[PDB]
Design a protein around this ligand. Structure first.
Ligand SMILES: Nc1nc2c(ncn2[C@@H]2O[C@H](COP(=O)(O)OP(=O)(O)O)[C@@H](O)[C@H]2O)c(=O)[nH]1
Ligand code: ALF
Ligand SMILES: [Ca+2]
Ligand SMILES: [Mg+2]
Ligand SMILES: [Mg+2]
Lengths: 317, 755
């Protein structure tokens, strides 16, 4: 069968592995009750990881716990070795429920831009009851939200009848990019993910360097490499849901000063970030097919990829 | 997960016991106990002079019915489950037995089990350089004389590498140095042993590392210089920054508070040359991450997706032609992690309705089949819970005995014996072979169902021995196209080395294809009458799972076998690379080039120095070999024979470079130390994909992979992700792209004047 090889490239925490899950849901073998059961542990770990990061945030940012009884719950959670968490029970459940209700921890959640905290924090912490229940089965939306850092090079083939796409998921962190050269042979298209929400964030690799500045430089660089002179480039401006919310209180002009668009505007901010990636590229060769995506929204990816499928095929035969 | 070896209060305090062999006349009562660290089993006899057994040299502990008994001496009844036998030795053949019948009853069991856990503990075998030194010290403190003193002549013997300097070191600490004098345990502390080592063993090699980076204002080192060192020089560059975060200031402080002796440097967050020496040989600066030595491999893939520790004519102790056959070799093989033993069975005598085991028409002693079966059900899952294969080479010309042969299998193995297929894996085409996880605590039988040696003429397959064969049903191999057309994962075929070699050179990719769904067993040729071994790496490279060897011959073949099967919890099952498992994929094992979707590595190995490598003053040289694909193999490198000593030799020789490792995930580094002449000191087998970067002590091992104590080497490694010769620019641009796009935007901004 006709087999074409796509690459999922991105900075790191952009949504490459999440895009892969939507492919497994849309064109793949989806997620059964047993598959889902394979994530419970990971959803329990993400909640601990997140509440531990916010517990460090309280000291680092010197924020007082509104309530005294939360100082104890904070010491109970901070001691847990996430790598061994296989269950989610009392006292831990009532301790994380109580920490999340502490105006002090809420004041710290609001300042998440000031430290590293995953995007699926609020999604999970606001649904603890459903997650704590001893009859808990992760929903498909629950699987699409989990955080599991990707390291190395993983090939996922998908049969779209008409064609078979061999999608390659990789690690985004700087150290992971030294490996990338080992999946550059015979590439048809490179689909690049950028986080629209990371315009006011810093790298986990380096906390004085701006995330969107990183993805911007990585994109402008990678499209001028010789392995890709005959390979199409689809740019997915992902996390459009997180930009809609954040843009309301985190002004783009404060991180990118050449933005002369209005504030508290999701679209003007959106179309400015697209220009930076595609425009005035001294190496303005390839046409770049862009798409605004929310990778945890199955119906969005279904529609977007149907279009990227057509584009890739055409620009080949 | 893994645990440090805790020594129960009973083994600490001690319990009374009677030590005996087959010659002992009088009742010799002794108090057995284990030091708090679980290094030595020690008992003080009649003379009051002590005897020590290294707990890391222990191979098995038996009790109840599996324990040794005598006769002559005698002690009435038999239910005396207070018999305990300790089996130790430096390889499966040279086993030594110690018997200790308990005085109180409910104790021998507790001991037998506790000693066993301590003896097979992973952290104990993979301990810090500091711990092996603290172990040496413990031996000097236990092996006291009849007057509870430490004989000076024991310190001269332990370091007979230089007796003249030893005298100067002891004298420098205000300790006795004369060969007639003794030292009181009270004035021979760990403090004064570490001081003793530091004045005897000058370390210009460590001086050169403190100067490296940095502090030329040299007496000490700063918290930052140490954090930057652990994070930059000692960190694995292949590891993800999120998965393996670097040390913080708060964590670098704990290290000074844990190792710095000078209570004044600790105050000013600084570390001394003595405090850095402690860290280099601490438990955070091991050559390997715990994840490598742990049972962390996925154990749910089909049985065909794994390399399996295997044995050839297990029953042999020496050569093939003539020699003795044993029941004990099975126990030793299985306890060592072996998951595939061979029972070359012959037919029983008329009056004596009992079939025996031996080779063939060779005047080689024979053992009863029934005695081999029991020895297997006994040891099969003591050191591993993963499945065991019984390779049957049947020569039974009898319907009765072959039936009585099946009867023993059901009788002795019971519920463990897999007699029928699993509900989930029916013996139909297209179905895959079960998980090792799916067959935990199971005995699978490999026999016929209805210079190759005695493997070229087996008898017919009767219904009794045919009704036990299910997932490992051997069949006449035709081609790969046939086994493929047929599509049966439960159908496996053996290949005598030379036969396996032809399929290796002619159809290597078709051989890998086959090994993704069916099992293949390789066994040495009938010519190797000295139970010689072939290099298993040849057949692993084509995905061969059951690559049997002669466990009685510790040549480089078995040393490599024990080396690689120490990993994955000694489970006896290693998961094959992804591109040697997936139907989707295929590559040429003879590829002289990198392979798309596989991350190649570069390895630089520099031999820096060695410590206490021999009891006699002699020159030392170290070999650094790499086993894996034919392109990834190098059995070449060798340092020059040391200065002239064996105490603290330093080597100044460029690093041994392995610039391109196509399949690093299948490569194993080998570091072997030798004396001028070829006398083997010790070695170590390290997986290339796990071996860490920077200065790390390599705690040496014997041919059997048992941990030596004093011998060690300080090596410097750089295990990195491979970057072609020219793509070094594009690599750096992908890693820190902002710097790259910062210059091209700067230059452009500087040219705006001239449009
Ligand atoms: N809200 C939101 N979350 C997302 C989106 N895409 C990814 N995420 C989340 O961000 C985290 C990182 O996703 P992942 O695919 O692992 O990042 P990768 O390293 O780029 O693979 C996961 O928890 C995802 O659920 C998005 O479009 N919207
Ligand atoms: F954010 Al990643 F591998 F791309 F964990
Ligand atoms: Ca044989
Ligand atoms: Mg990823
Ligand atoms: Mg380290």
């Amino acid at each position: 069968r006709r087999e074409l090889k796509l690459l999922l490239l991105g900075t790191g925490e952009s949504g490459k592995s999440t895009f892969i899950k939507q492919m497994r849901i849309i064109h793949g073998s989806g997620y059964s009750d047993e598959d889902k059961r394979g994530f419970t542990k990971l959803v329990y770990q993400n909640i601990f990881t997140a509440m531990q990061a916010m517990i460090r945030a309280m000291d680092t940012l010197k924020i007082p716990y509104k309530y005294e009884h939360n100082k104890a719950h904070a010491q109970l959670v901070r001691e847990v070795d996430v790598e061994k968490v296989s269950a989610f029970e009392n006292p831990y459940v009532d301790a994380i429920k109580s920490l999340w209700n502490d105006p002090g921890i809420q004041e710290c959640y609001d300042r998440r831009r000031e430290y590293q905290l995953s995007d699926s924090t609020k999604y999970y912490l606001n649904d603890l009851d459903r997650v704590a229940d001893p009859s808990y089965l992760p929903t498909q939306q629950d699987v699409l939200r989990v955080r599991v850092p990707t390291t190395g090079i993983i090939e996922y083939p998908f049969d779209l009848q008409s064609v078979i796409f061999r999608m390659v998921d990789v690690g985004g962190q700087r150290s992971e990019r030294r490996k990338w050269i080992h999946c550059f042979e015979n590439v048809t298209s490179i689909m690049f993910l950028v986080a629209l929400s990371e315009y006011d964030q810093v790298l986990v690799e380096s906390d004085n360097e701006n995330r969107m500045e990183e993805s911007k430089a990585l994109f402008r660089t990678i499209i001028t490499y010789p392995w890709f002179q005959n390979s199409s480039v689809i740019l997915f401006l992902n996390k459009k849901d997180l930009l809609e919310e954040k843009i309301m209180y985190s002004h783009l002009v404060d991180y990118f000063p050449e933005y002369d668009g209005p504030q508290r505007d999701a679209q003007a901010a959106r179309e400015f970030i697209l220009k930076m990636f595609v425009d005035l590229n001294p190496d303005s060769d390839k046409i770049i097919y862009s798409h605004f995506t929310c990778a945890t929204d199955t119906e969005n990816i279904r529609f977007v990829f149907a279009a990227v499928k057509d584009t890739i095929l055409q620009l080949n035969l | 997960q893994l645990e440090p070896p805790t020594v129960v209060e009973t083994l600490r305090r001690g319990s009374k016991f009677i030590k005996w062999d087959e010659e002992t006349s009088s009742r010799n009562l002794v108090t057995l106990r284990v030091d708090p660290n679980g290094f030595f089993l020690y008992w003080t006899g009649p003379n009051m002079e002590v005897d020590t057994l290294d707990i890391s040299s222990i191979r098995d502990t038996r009790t109840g019915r599996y324990a040794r008994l005598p006769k002559d001496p005698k002690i009435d009844a038999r239910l005396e489950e207070k018999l305990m036998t300790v089996v130790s030795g430096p390889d499966p053949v040279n086993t030594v037995f110690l018997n200790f019948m308990a005085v109180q009853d409910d104790t021998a069991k507790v001991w037998s089990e506790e000693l066993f856990k301590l003896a097979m503990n992973i952290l104990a075998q993979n301990a810090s350089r500091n711990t092996f030194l603290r172990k040496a010290y413990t031996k000097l403190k236990l092996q006291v004389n009849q007057d509870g003193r430490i004989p000076v002549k024991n310190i001269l013997k332990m370091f007979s590498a230089d007796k003249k300097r030893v005298e100067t070191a002891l004298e420098s600490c205000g300790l006795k140095f004369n060969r007639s004098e003794s030292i009181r345990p009270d004035e021979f502390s760990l403090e004064i042993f570490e001081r003793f080592l530091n004045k005897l063993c000058l370390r210009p090699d460590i001086d050169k590392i403190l100067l490296e980076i940095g502090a030329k204002g040299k007496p000490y080192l700063t918290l930052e210089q140490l954090m930057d060192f652990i994070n930059q020089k000692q960190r694995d560059p292949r590891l993800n920054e999120v998965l393996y975060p670097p040390l913080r200031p708060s964590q670098a402080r704990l290290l000074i508070e844990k190792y710095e002796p000078n209570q004044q440097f600790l105050e000013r967050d600084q570390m001394s040359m003595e405090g850095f020496s402690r860290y280099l040989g601490g438990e955070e600066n091991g050559i390997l991450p715990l994840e490598a030595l742990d049972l962390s491999t996925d154990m749910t893939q089909p049985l065909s997706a794994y390399f399996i520790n295997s044995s050839h004519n297990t029953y042999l102790t020496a050569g093939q032609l003539a020699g003795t056959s044993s029941v004990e070799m099975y126990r030793q093989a299985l306890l060592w992690g072996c998951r595939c033993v061979e029972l070359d069975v012959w037919k029983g005598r008329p009056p004596e309705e009992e079939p025996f085991i031996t080779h063939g028409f060779t005047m080689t002693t024979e053992v009863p089949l029934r005695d081999v079966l029991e020895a297997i059900a006994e040891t099969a899952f003591k050191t591993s819970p993963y499945p065991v294969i019984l390779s049957f080479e049947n020569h039974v010309d009898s319907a009765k005995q072959q039936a009585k042969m099946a009867e023993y299998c059901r009788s002795i193995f019971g519920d463990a014996l897999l007699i029928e297929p699993l509900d989930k894996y029916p013996l139909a085409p297209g179905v895959p072979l079960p998980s090792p996880q799916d067959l935990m605590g199971r005995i699978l039988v490999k026999n016929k169902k209805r210079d190759e040696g005695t493997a070229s003429s087996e008898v017919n397959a009767t219904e009794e021995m045919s009704t036990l064969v299910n997932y490992i049903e051997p069949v006449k191999f035709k081609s790969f196209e046939a086994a493929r057309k047929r599509n049966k994962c439960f159908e496996m075929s053996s290949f005598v080395e030379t036969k396996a070699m032809e399929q290796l050179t002619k159809s290597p990719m078709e051989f890998v294809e086959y090994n993704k769904q069916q099992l293949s067993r390789i066994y040495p040729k009938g010519t190797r009458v000295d139970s010689s071994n072939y290099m298993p790496q040849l057949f692993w490279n084509v995905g061969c799972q059951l690559v049997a060897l002669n466990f009685q011959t510790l040549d480089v073949a078995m040393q490599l076998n024990a080396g690689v099967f120490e990993y994955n919890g000694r489970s006896g099952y290693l998961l094959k690379p992804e591109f040697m498992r997936r139907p989707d994929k295929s590559f040429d094992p003879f590829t002289e080039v990198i392979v798309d979707g596989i991350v190649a590595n570069a390895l630089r190995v520099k031999v820096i120095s060695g410590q206490f490598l021999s009891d006699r003053k002699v020159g030392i040289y170290v070999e650094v070999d790499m086993f894996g694909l034919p392109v990834d193999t190098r059995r070449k490198y060798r340092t020059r024979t040391s200065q002239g000593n064996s105490f603290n030799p330093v080597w100044d020789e460029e690093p041994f470079d392995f610039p391109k490792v196509v399949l690093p995930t299948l490569a194993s580094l080998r570091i072997a130390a030798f004396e001028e002449g070829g006398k083997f000191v010790g070695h170590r087998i390290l997986p290339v994909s796990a071996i860490r970067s920077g200065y790390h002590y390599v705690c040496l091992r014997n041919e059997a992979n048992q941990p030596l104590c004093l011998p060690a080497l300080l090596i410097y490694t750089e295990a990195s992700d491979y970057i072609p010769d020219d793509h070094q620019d594009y690599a750096e641009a992908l890693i820190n792209p902002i710097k790259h796009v910062s210059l091209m935007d700067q230059r452009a901004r500087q040219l705006a004047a001239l449009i």
